[PDB]
Symmetry: D2
């Protein structure tokens, strides 16, 4: 199988582990995190929004016993000193937050893994990849790859259809977003100075910033610069919705043409629904974006149109499943 190591056992790594149990041909052989394995198991066994774990987890000496396999654990802050050489590590899923610079992620490579996928936006001379949107830009010469953001993966396939079948001029975004753990529980000083994230996370509508629309050009170059936008974090623990309002070059555009162009590009990454769903219905899904045709909208005043669309995504598992897809493809580029 493809031998995967996870660096960081946060929400993302733990869900990537769960997800990989569902994907044949991938095995997590190693998990590196500073937390004690007792607590790590407990956060793996139990999950507030993603549910109980499917199977049995137990802490054994040197790691965990999970569904009858061995996962070796490490508590090692210098990733260059992890034994990726002798574990024959194919891909590292980098989920710590301390390694989003390519020059800094080359430690996994020096520790002898063959390829690293950063589970965040990343800086340096690397490629940023949204699976099924532009992974066909990977030629296998890459050793460090960005997995983009959770919001980019909800956006990109919607923007690519908009732009491809209608010209894209410009557009703006709002992701009504689930609150995350970098928001405070009660009103208190926030570690990065953010006055809005400083506020009780489950009691408020909280504006905040998002890099995803501004960065999209890294995934779809031909629309680089043409998008920007924000977020509003609201009290659901996971589950998100990206609204996009655009101006298109093609004139006289219908709701029905938009919806039809999205449906035509459905696949495993990009879903499509016409059902009247809410956020909790997408918790745990494995689509990267679930285009919602109940919300397509065309405002027309003379020759001039504003077009608005919305796509769902579990900012946890939607992004995890796209990571695992890209993770595997990186491996398969080794022949």
């Amino acid at each position: 199988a493809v031998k995967v190591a996870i660096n960081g056992f946060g929400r993302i790594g733990r869900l990537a582990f769960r997800r990989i149990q569902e994907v044949e041909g991938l095995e997590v052989v190693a998990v590196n995190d500073l937390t004690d394995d007792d607590m790590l198991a407990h956060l793996l066994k139990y999950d507030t929004m993603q549910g109980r774990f499917t199977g049995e987890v137990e802490v054994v000496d040197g790691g965990f016993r999970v569904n009858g396999k061995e996962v070796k654990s490490f508590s090692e802050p210098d990733a260059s000193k992890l034994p990726w050489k002798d574990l024959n590590i194919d891909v590292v899923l980098e989920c710590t937050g301390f390694y989003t610079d390519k020059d800094k992620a080359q430690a996994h490579i020096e520790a002898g893994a063959k390829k690293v996928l950063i589970s965040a936006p990343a800086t340096g001379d690397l490629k940023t990849i949204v699976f099924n949107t532009n992974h066909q830009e990977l030629d296998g010469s890459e050793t460090v790859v960005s997995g983009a953001s959770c919001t980019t993966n909800s956006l990109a396939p919607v923007a690519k259809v908009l732009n491809d079948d209608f010209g894209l001029v410009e557009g703006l975004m709002t992701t009504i977003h689930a609150y995350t753990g970098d928001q405070n529980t009660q009103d208190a000083p926030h570690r990065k100075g953010d006055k809005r994230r400083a506020r009780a996370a489950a009691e408020n509508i909280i504006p905040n910033s998002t890099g995803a629309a501004k960065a999209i050009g890294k995934v779809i170059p031909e629309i680089d610069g043409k998008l920007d936008g924000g977020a509003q974090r609201v009290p659901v623990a996971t589950g998100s919705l990206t609204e996009l309002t655009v101006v298109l070059e093609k004139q006289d555009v219908t709701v029905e043409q938009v919806n039809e162009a999205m449906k035509n590009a459905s696949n495993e990454s990009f879903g499509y629904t016409e059902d009247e769903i809410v956020s909790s219905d997408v918790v745990g899904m494995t689509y990267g974006s679930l285009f919602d045709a109940t919300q397509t909208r065309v405002m027309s005043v003379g020759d001039r149109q504003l077009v608005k669309v919305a796509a769902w995504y579990d900012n946890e598992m939607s992004y995890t499943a796209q990571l695992v897809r890209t993770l595997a493809y990186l491996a398969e580029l080794s022949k």
Copy 2:
């Protein structure tokens, strides 16, 4: 003292009562609600989001004694049978849902009231009024008036300015709106058949249909048909935000230009701020709309622009402040 009657003692109707305590000149003399007085008194005295009643409430024989004043109480399904002439009612606040038409609400007039303000949009040949946006259209000859909806009251001052100072071509709207009492507590059939208002209210991001933007032109006739949009209901009990994405006819606009223009329009209906606030900060405010300059964005690609602005409101108390303002002005046209 202006003699005020409240028809229907729901959220709208009880907040009106509370707000009127803080306005001198106005006096609630009668309340009509089919609910027994004991329970009504209890929901007056206690309020989950709006607080304890600043004062003292008690059920006496013919109604309540509030702060040493007599409030008459009726339990009468038929408006035209209410003793409004007996009490010299100057204006009825109509909050039941059952008289949201010009000719229906006319029943209050036959019963004795001088004028009626409908706390809701209304069909018929009546004027719809957002105070400090278009109440100048009232010429004194109106017996029956609509106070518009709680979303319209937060949209109008913003659209007015954008249309006046720059040329509003078209726009689209999303209100990240608190959840309301017509949403289901748990997943269950919905009495109006709405598949989204059927889901659990405080557990979901729920898309919904909004009336306000489609009908903005009853308040501002010169932008009729240029706005549309909807709501995202989210798990806060009150406090909302209206995002507006628009195309203007002035094509070299800046964020400064937009914000300054909004501050120049500042008053006791249209607040202005540059504090990074969140939804629970506007709970119980009496601005009908609080513009947020920190959220203004202008997007320029080539020489085409998109502009996004946002404004806060208590979908309860904001709307309530505006309704009492229009109440007073309607009783003012005795002159």
Copy 3:
């Protein structure tokens, strides 16, 4: 397979549908409810707390096709007109709320069904059953049965192990309960004039009355009238905890004694845990009651003790699992 009909497709009925999908030898062939099929399918298809439906739901001509099997759907007010003779109905699961009486439920027999299980407490001369606590009192002569309440099934295994291994002198119960559909979304008047259920459910801690404790004697007759209690309704949508504070006649009781007595009585209905779990961790589980050992407490002052124990239960799906268990038993009494 045993042919099951569900009267009333509310939370209990849709969950009973789902659980029966996981029991071999059990089949739901008909559902009665006054709501349209389109809304009912949507509610079976999408659940806020129990997850996307496992499988495929579609509305077909005379009802539903679910996982390749047709399910007849009726909207028939009158129970005794239901084609249960023609559908060879072994057990009707009665979940509407209006037939919580032995003699009222006879209508299902009069319609030709073989047995009725009432999914609530019921009055009249019949039996109240908590599976794996007192279902052996079922001899086979019963046509109508009650499956008690969700809170009863959680308390009954625990109180039995307490009364058997030590003598129960008295006790008091508090269940920290998920809020339910019978509570209001916003502060508003309430169907049964309850000043507390009238308050916003997801925003308060709400005291409310219970019955499961005063009525324990129906399932355990030797401790009749020796328990009482109430509930505190809090903002989790599903998942509860029952705390029981008891006086025993056995006198040098220890935490280890209690816990061990509880562990030994463990079965498919009565779970045992020592993990430090929280409410969401039991959402969807199938134990009728999950004993939490980490919560056991003994207060000793001289020769006088006080013991406290606590058990989790998914107030929805734990009670669903129990009902289905008793349904299967009722059908296995084909002599």
Copy 4:
């Protein structure tokens, strides 16, 4: 004019400040907290559960201006280095959590503060005080004093009545408690390793241990060791409830006795209500504890009785109101 210094401007700090504004005789001349003034001032003006600051708050050279008063701002880790001498600090409120021991708090006295009130339970040769419960014990000799905990203040006036009037044999306690800032926002490793405080605070019923009941002896020594208990922390952001279940010497006790007993011992710390209220109703109250006579229960099985009672409190402002009472009393013990 009692000159007050506040060390740590957390929830306890900012609310103590707010409480002090409405108390004639006290003024906060200084605040020390390592967070920049700009952020601290923002978090004082805007509070999620407690409302906007009534008044004006601005940042000025050297600190804050609040309602036309100067408040000096420092940000010093070393308490000994703080200029309490020069500012003639009569009392310091110790609200950082890191000085919760008498030889730790002394660092303020050496700095020239006359007296110190620690806003938490603290260890050492000091006294632990619940105003209007055991503050009679202060003689004027103390320089450091603990204010106990926000549950001890809740529990102590109910215990005392029970003990004096009926004679407390033993009892156990459960407090249904709002979730606090030390709980995680999302599932993650916890600062103190607590596996239950490691979980999403707003999406769970969470058991957690509390010392309050165990250490009740520090306030009412004549029932030391007689109580034990725990907490259930639920998704309300402030407002809590302490449920006590006791055994008494005096028997044949009625509900009407217990309730009149608590009615008579009611003061400005200890309230008493017979209304059907809920947690939100007690947010921002300034009783230390509010007795709920609607939740009194007397289980009488034959000869032996179990008694239960309950009392609400706002774990924020109720405690804070109590502190500011004790603090004021410590200052006037400098005649």
